[PDB]
């Protein structure tokens, strides 16, 4: 019982906490006592489901008011007060790497954890090594070690914190660790996981995507009402449109989207976040749902009436769509979303990217029409999703087990 103790230091915000909680549950399944180290003032952000999951899952609260100097102090006292067994390792979100030196002084091996895909980290590193910053228009710079379709164009240099060609933040965040765990699986990003391993010279394992277990609030409509609507449309006829909660297109571009949906004959669900497309809901009758508030994204993506996903290509949305075989129409806005869009459209070939500044109504009608009619990407998306039906991907299960073998020798 309890082969060892493994600590985990999550990052709170941007969707880093839940992946970490899922990684805790998966690690504990290998007979490890996993402890999540958090600031006390955020204790409420952890559901009772995690605390009472099992006797191998624990939460330690470091007393913090509400910068992170108090954290480091409390982590120091916590490690020094422990009377248990020396922990086998600590898993630190790369965004919490400032605390690495504390666990190094206590002689605890440090494992880095990235909650996003490997493609964005790998392409970011490659762009920096290929000095894409000095690219000229019309030039195309392939990244050695990565697929040719990921080659950088001068247009890629514009992405609405570190820009293309700059040293990505993960390099120094991972420096000092003995291994790197990424929230992905070989089925999704094999070539980029390997690239990450070859450049860092550390073992890199894909132990995700760490999605809610169901994968295997205020709103315009209710869950049952949305399903009712989906049940009334033909198979794979609905395009789900959502830019998440962080960022979105310009107001001018949103109007173009509105005009496109009004002219087209395609059923759609358009989720909007605090703009409003007035009165699109009236003009289109029941061909479209304009959901204000939050929408049941997992229900929508898993419904057989959903045949496309217009997404900003954030990693979580991308992984959910891939796991359900819903092709993506990529409208990336910021950060890693651009490399995620390249992944689906050019590497995995399970989607397309909006093309042809600012996108016009015609560009949006063309892109929605091309995606929903593309039988190749639909067949490819469904084929790839078969690896995600029946349970956690086998690659992630073996990868995590390979990691457990590594940190225990």
UniProtKB/TrEMBL annotation:
UniProt KW keywords: Glycosyltransferase, Transferase
E.C. number: 2.4.1.-
Family annotation (InterPro entries): UDP_glucos_trans, UDP_glycos_trans_CS
Gene Ontology molecular function terms on file: UDP-glucosyltransferase activity
Superkingdom: Eukaryota
Listed GO biological process terms: glycoside biosynthetic process
Pfam families named among the record's database cross-references: UDPGT
CDD domains listed in its UniProt record: GT1_Gtf-like
Protein family (similarity comment): Belongs to the UDP-glycosyltransferase family.
Protein name: Glycosyltransferase
Source organism (scientific name): Pilosella officinarum
């Amino acid at each position: 019982k309890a082969t060892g103790e493994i600590f985990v230091v999550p990052f709170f915000g941007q969707g880093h906490l839940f992946p970490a909680m899922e990684l805790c549950k998966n690690i504990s399944a290998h007979n490890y006592n996993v402890t999540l180290i958090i600031p006390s003032h955020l204790s409420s952000s952890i559901p009772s489901t995690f605390s009472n999951h099992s006797s191998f899952i624990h939460v330690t609260e470091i007393s913090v008011a509400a910068q992170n100097l108090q954290m480091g102090k409390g982590i120091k006292s916590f490690l020094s007060a422990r009377s248990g067994t020396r922990p086998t390792c600590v898993v630190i979100d790369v965004m919490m790497s400032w605390s690495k030196e504390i666990f190094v002084d206590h002689e605890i091996p440090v494992v880095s954890f990235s909650t996003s895909g490997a493609t964005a980290s790998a392409v970011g590193y490659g762009m920096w090594k290929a000095e894409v910053g000095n690219m000229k228009p019309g030039e195309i710079r392939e990244i050695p070690g990565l697929p040719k379709e990921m080659a950088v164009t001068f247009a890629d240099l514009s992405r609405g914190s570190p820009g293309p060609g700059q040293k990505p933040r993960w390099v120094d965040e991972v420096d000092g660790s003995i291994a790197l765990l990424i929230n992905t699986c070989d089925d999704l990003e094999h070539v980029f996981i390997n690239y990450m391993a070859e450049q860092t010279k550390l073992p890199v394992w894909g132990v995700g995507p760490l999605l809610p277990e169901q994968f295997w609030h205020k709103s315009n409509y209710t869950e049952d009402e949305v399903v009712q609507w989906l049940e009334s449309k033909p198979r794979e006829s609905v395009i789900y449109i959502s830019f998440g909660s962080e960022v979105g297109p310009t107001i001018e571009e949103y109007k173009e989207l509105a005009k496109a949906l009004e002219e087209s004959d395609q059923p759609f669900i358009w989720v909007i976040q605090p703009y409003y497309p007035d009165g699109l809901d009236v003009t289109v009758g029941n061909r479209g749902l304009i959901i204000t508030g939050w929408a049941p994204q997992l229900l929508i993506l898993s419904h057989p009436s959903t045949g496309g996903f217009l997404s900003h290509c954030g990693w979580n949305s991308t992984a959910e769509a891939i796991g359900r075989g819903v092709p993506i129409l990529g409208w990336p806005i910021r950060g890693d979303q651009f490399d995620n869009a390249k992944l689906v459209a050019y590497h995995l070939k399970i989607g397309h990217v909006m093309s042809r500044g600012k996108f016009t109504k015609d560009d949006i009608t063309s892109g929605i029409e091309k995606l929903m009619k593309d039988e190749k990407v639909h067949k490819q998306a469904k084929e790839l999703s078969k690896e995600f039906e029946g349970g956690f991907p086998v690659s992630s299960v073996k990868a995590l087990g390979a990691f457990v073998e590594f940190i225990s020798q």
